[PDB]
């Protein structure tokens, strides 16, 4: 993956924006949904995170369910150097 | 089952397009006006923005940010 | 002020029968509780879905064929009722599974 660096910031900031990604198996396709990049290097950057040990992967009907861990939140944070008081969206705790 | 045999090629070998690294490639873009001003060489592509230079091949210069759109003779 | 009549209609769908019958009876009983006129819970023909598959996953052996089916029922009900009463009725007591649809039919 010669993933362009600006699209790299884009994938990281979006994974910050919600914290959970889907990225259907379908290679070959022009545009990752709500991300505006080719799906293929999205898949490969995210699995690069998984191999580094900051994203857990789960497979279900060809849909790459991806979840972000605490040390992943860290790595993302100093990549964006956004202040440490703020968190991705998942940790917005809502009561029943 | 399936039984295979060693593949034999009809072309000797294809070599990768090794990138041509050039020593001090930027010396030929800009020149000094005898300890002073700076000057360009051979043309400047206007659409891309300042500082982008065209590619001479022969009797015509060629882009490479907007490579195919801009290829202007001279 | 929506006291005028709207000729509302309630469509139902359910892969089962018991909960569909309970829902229809409950709607009728609530309508009688508020004393509205109606056309009865007319039943719709059993829409049966049948698809057949080769029971073997590979394709050998004695030719075996299996049939998988559902049976859905609609049972639409039309009410000559005002606005907010029927809205409250249709937005309460919906047991899970039975899909309910409401149309003004204006």
């Amino acid at each position: 993956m010669l993933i362009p660096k600006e699209d790299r910031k884009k994938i990281y900031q979006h994974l910050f924006q919600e914290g959970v990604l889907v990225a259907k198996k379908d290679f070959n396709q022009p545009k990752h949904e709500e991300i505006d990049t080719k799906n293929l290097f999205v898949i490969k950057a995210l699995q690069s995170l998984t191999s580094k040990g900051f994203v857990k992967t789960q497979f279900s009907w060809q849909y790459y369910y991806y979840t972000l861990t605490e040390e992943g939140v860290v790595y993302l944070r100093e990549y964006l150097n956004l202040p440490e008081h703020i968190f991705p969206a998942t940790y917005l705790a809502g009561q029943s | 089952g399936k039984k295979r045999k060693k593949k034999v090629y009809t072309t000797p070998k294809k070599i990768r397009h090794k990138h041509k690294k050039v020593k001090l490639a930027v010396l030929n873009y800009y020149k000094v006006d005898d300890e002073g001003k700076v000057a360009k060489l051979r043309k400047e592509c206007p659409n891309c923005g300042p500082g982008i230079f065209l590619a001479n091949h022969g009797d015509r210069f060629y882009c490479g940010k907007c490579h195919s759109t801009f290829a202007t003779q001279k | 002020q929506e006291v005028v009549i709207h000729k509302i209609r309630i469509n139902l769908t359910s892969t089962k029968v018991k909960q569909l019958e309970n829902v229809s009876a409950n709607i009728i009983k609530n309508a009688e509780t508020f004393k509205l006129v109606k056309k009865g819970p007319v039943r719709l023909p059993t829409k049966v879905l049948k698809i057949s598959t080769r029971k073997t996953p590979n394709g050998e052996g004695s030719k075996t064929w299996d049939t998988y089916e559902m049976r859905i029922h609609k049972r639409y009900i039309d009410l000559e009722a005002p606005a907010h009463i029927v809205k409250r009725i249709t937005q309460i007591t919906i047991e899970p599974g039975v899909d309910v649809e409401v149309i003004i039919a204006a």
């Binding site: 198996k25 070959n28 009907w61 060809q62 | - | 892969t15 879905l49 698809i51 598959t53 080769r54 029971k55 996953p57 299996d66 049939t67 998988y68 089916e69 559902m70 049976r71």
Partner: protein, 55 residues
């Protein structure tokens, strides 16, 4: 893999135009009602889906 060449062939229609949504197998697909599942993962998951043995 000049983008104009690689993967350029259209798959609007035909065998390979549809995947199983389960394994992606092109062979033996159930396109009725857009199940888009093959015969056999479908017989696996049908009792969970809502299909049942009646007759």
């Amino acid at each position: 893999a000049h983008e104009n060449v690689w993967y350029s062939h259209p798959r609007k229609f035909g065998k390979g135009s549809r995947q199983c949504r389960i394994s992606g197998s092109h062979s033996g697909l159930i396109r009725k009602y857009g199940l888009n599942i093959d015969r056999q993962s479908f017989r696996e998951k049908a009792n969970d889906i809502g299909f049942y043995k009646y007759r």
